[PDB]
């Protein structure tokens, strides 16, 4: 059984918290992705597999989510497992219950917990107190490891080899921490990176220095130019929010500058992959949603299979 | 296997969006109802069947619901399928995500979506963008096709043949669109229809003309008279809301006029079936809830089996 | 099959509403607890059992909950059953639907309902109208029978024989109705009870008289003294809320008086069991959470297996 053989191999994910991309190796991720491909084939054949039938996953989201909370629910159920989605707004959180009490409560009922919480330190709280694996679905928006895993998987699935690709990040590269996580995962590969942002929203110096240290920094630009677009293999977009500028007029100019529409794609390659972790506002125009190069819906689908692979490893 | 044979037959529901009663034929509905009866027998025997074990249903309600959202959850699970109920109030809808982005997101995880949304055009959005079947659970309250299906099923189950029945609609026949949908489904049958409403809440002219064209209009009345009641086989009630009248005094008089209580039933037939799509306020009095003719709880139960039949056809 | 044999025996829980501890006998609870132990062994072996595969449980919480709503969901799913958690804040309750209409609605879809509602009389509404078993998860905070069952189970599991134990209740013994329910369950056993509370929050006279009638009242004290602690086998704590005192200064003094921390445990026995139904505020200090005598997390876990035993009896 192809999947049974892969799931039997050693893995850093097994029985592990999944809190940071810094916990995992290139080899860890290659096995994850191999399993994800087999999960997709299994789902195509069977819909709901028989991998985690005796296991129960809690999801615990203190901040809004559609992709991350629903995809983990679907992934668990499509492994044959059971899910318990916790509605924090009507839980005893409303009576003052701390995060560490909530996690120890749910650990009595479930075999693992997916957590999204507004305090960056929630992952330290989880490590200290929670006696079952916790999967970080977002800690004060600092990290989101399974978003990073699925972003990298999307690139590999869409284009094949990483060698020689040029990846262009556009938008808010300061508060867009998915960019930072993906930069870390890219450190193993012979890629080149272009960074397009307002000066104010450039990468933090430590993340820029990671690209320099890996020999990957190709250019930083305030403009999304034809030349930058024409060499782009992956165009990875982030949302720019109004709070990032003192004036609405500057916010609107910046949005106009970075909006991906047909006037943008005309300068891209025929094979350029447009990605966005979502949700989006208007920074990728609706008019390109049926273009072959609009990959941000496929990206979500790749996320399902990546999360199936992850849950099976953590909880097998 | 009786059910397996029925589910193998051709059906307009298979792999279809379910957006309007106008999509489906009398023959479509007869097969649906035959399957619904077998679903009930299966549930009586087994509780949870093995029909949709590898399938996943998302429910996506932007407006309050008890019957429609819970019955679809229960129907799917009682087919052996899996459900993912999406809480819109804590989803990325709260971060601005459009309906079409939400539908394409959930289509990555699920095999069909039940949608209730306040924009009548949500069904056009679904048709344009959603790559899995969408079942309309209410579009700006304009249509609610599975409510219409279960309303018709209820009549057939309670009384048998449609031939010769007199159906009396009472309450708000202008904003009570379930009345309009049921009128459309009744166009095939030799029934007679009585319409009891304030003048202001009469049927729209196009719906009245449907009854005229079918030779079914028996009378329009502002009063729920003994004579109207005495010829009623089905008394189908809708909620009248305070916003429908400029003054509270007129609202209260209208409510008093149309309230179904024991003083009403004394004029009805011993076999009259009292229906209401629910929720109700006070327009059907609590005092008649244990009367044999109070069919609005049985109506909800018939809805479960109708929705089991529907989901099995759409997703088989 | 050990569990199959126990589940086949007669039980007052079978096909019963579970509304009050006064419905059930010592023999009823002993069978429940025997089954709970076997449920734990089953879950350890299999994760998800095959006991209630064809059954569906609705949960219906009008007030916040983490333990009770999640544990019943997990218990049902770990029996192999299906769950439908109803979000009241987005249900037709928001359109005015009464409790009795909501219960009769959900009874069309499910085989039993867990209810938590702010009206003490909700249990009478359920008995009158609901045609499937209802399990009281809290009725205007007056009773919470499965909390009482799991509290008693926790004592037995932690200490073994009830004979000769001294149980010390501390905090708000007037509004802390779990204390009153546990007092009722303790009436069969040769225990002694100490009551530590502000004068204002002493037991109601009828509950005090129950302890007197059973020969169990050892002392009432405003102070949590070394002498009281040194004879305590079970220290059962309740939350004291600010509304219980006219002034904040008195509230803070009372909290300081009754807070369980290391300075408290130094006077307790090495075998003292510290319990709390939860949620807690600060009345049990975080610093003792990893002490062997801190049993309030294990208490929640015992609750899962108790509720598995309960659901299997009610719905087998």
Numbering used by the authors:
A (entry chain A), B (entry chain A), C (entry chain A): 1938 to 2253
Quote from the publication.
CAD is a 1.5 MDa hexameric protein with four enzymatic domains responsible for initiating de novo biosynthesis of pyrimidines nucleotides: glutaminase, carbamoyl phosphate synthetase, aspartate transcarbamoylase (ATC), and dihydroorotase. Moreover, in fungi, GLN, CPS, and ATC are fused into a CAD-like protein with an inactive DHO-like domain, and the DHO activity is encoded as an independent enzyme. The crystal structures of the ATC domains of human CAD and the CAD-like protein from the fungus Chaetomium thermophilum showed a dome-shaped homotrimer with three active sites between the subunits that are very similar to bacterial and plant ATCs. Here, we report the insertion by site-directed mutagenesis of two cysteine (Cys) residues in the ATC domain that favor the formation of disulfide bridges between subunits in the trimer.
